[PDB]
Amino acid sequence: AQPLKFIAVDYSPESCTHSPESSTITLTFDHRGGSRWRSTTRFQYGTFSSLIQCPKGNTSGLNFNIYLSSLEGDKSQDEIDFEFLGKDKRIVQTNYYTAGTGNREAIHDLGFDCSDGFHEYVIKWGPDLIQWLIDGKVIRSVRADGEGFPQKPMFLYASVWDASYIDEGRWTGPYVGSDAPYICLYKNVNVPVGTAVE
Ligand SMILES: OC[C@H]1O[C@@H](O)[C@H](O)[C@@H](O)[C@@H]1O[C@@H]1O[C@H](CO[C@H]2OC[C@@H](O)[C@H](O)[C@H]2O)[C@@H](O[C@@H]2O[C@H](CO)[C@@H](O[C@@H]3O[C@H](CO[C@H]4OC[C@@H](O)[C@H](O)[C@H]4O)[C@@H](O)[C@H](O)[C@H]3O)[C@H](O)[C@H]2O)[C@H](O)[C@H]1O
């Protein structure tokens, strides 16, 4: 594993702040919206990790995340996700996509408030096994079957966005915004050294 130091920012770069000397990338959500960072290379399998401290206060409406995707915006994509749902800061959702088909959501109870400090989130991606880990514990394991598996090379992505418009607000809640600016911290992001492609 190696630190990720070369990133790209896909929109609203003034809402993404990188402090290389502290190995910390910070995404802000406020009246300007949010932002999204990514690796500049794709990867073909490997282990991906980050310390994450989610935003303070009433995060209803917001989605903050870290995920692998073959290309954000593509509708036939492969993906592996961690997504925090802002109305409940004591859960995280995992999911994965195969050629544009998802619908494999699972909700996990964290046992902590995801904004209380840094916690470690890890995705291990292989051709027949994917694991999600939180603070060193496997929380989900999936194996390849006839129903598809993520195999395209993928970028590492993270964003904060207002998802309150999704499913009439049932997914992340209405956006209240009482505690803007919301700041999500990503520290010690680590990506595979030898399966980067590109
Ligand atoms: O949750 C992570 C991940 O989970 C998977 O399950 C899913 O497959 C992924 O798509 C999802 O990724 C995140 O998706 C959101 C929503 O966008 C997606 O669906 C809609 C489609 O339009 C997108 O292409 C998909 O990516 C995404 O958040 C949005 O990203 C947009 C950019 O692609 C943002 O639009 C941009 O906003 C800029 C800022 O200003 C505008 O928005 C804020 C307003 O205040 C302002 O008035 C607007 O002008 C614009 O400058 C820019 O032109 C515009 O393109 C959008 O705001 C944002 O919500 C996450 O980034 C992504 O990680």
Residue 50 belongs to domain with CATH number: 2.60.120.200
Options 14, 21, 72, 83, the catalytic residue: 83
156: exposed, middle or buried (Cβ count in 10 Å: 0-12, 13-18, 19+): buried
Please state, in angstroms and as integers, the Cα–Cα distance from residue 114 to each residue in 110, 118, 171, following that order. Answer: 8, 8, 17
The whole-angstrom separation of Cα 137 and Cα 122 is 9
12 lines ligand 1 (CB under 6 A): yes
Residue 79 designated active-site: yes
Q: What is the number of structural domains in the chain?
A: 1
67 lines ligand 1 (CB under 6 A): yes
Experiment type:
X-ray
Options 79, 105, 120, 168, the catalytic residue: 79
The residue whose CA is least distant from atom 55 of ligand 1 is 11
Q: Which two tokens stand for residue 181?
A: 């600016």
Tokens 């959500």 label which residue? 29
Give the residue numbers spanning the domain of 169. Answer: 1-198
Residue 83 designated active-site: yes
Shortest-distance atom of ligand 1 to CA 32: 45
Radius of gyration of the chain (CA): 16
175: exposed, middle or buried (Cβ count in 10 Å: 0-12, 13-18, 19+): buried
Choose among 194, 50, 196: nearest CA to 123: 50
Distance between first and last Cα of the chain: 17
Choose one of 7, 9, 10, 11 to mutate for the ligand 1 pocket test, by most ligand atoms within 8 angstroms of C-beta.
11
119: exposed, middle or buried (Cβ count in 10 Å: 0-12, 13-18, 19+): buried
Q: Which two tokens stand for residue 192?
A: 């595979």
The residue whose CA is least distant from atom 62 of ligand 1 is 159
| Resolution given for this structure, in angstroms | 1.6
DSSP 40: S
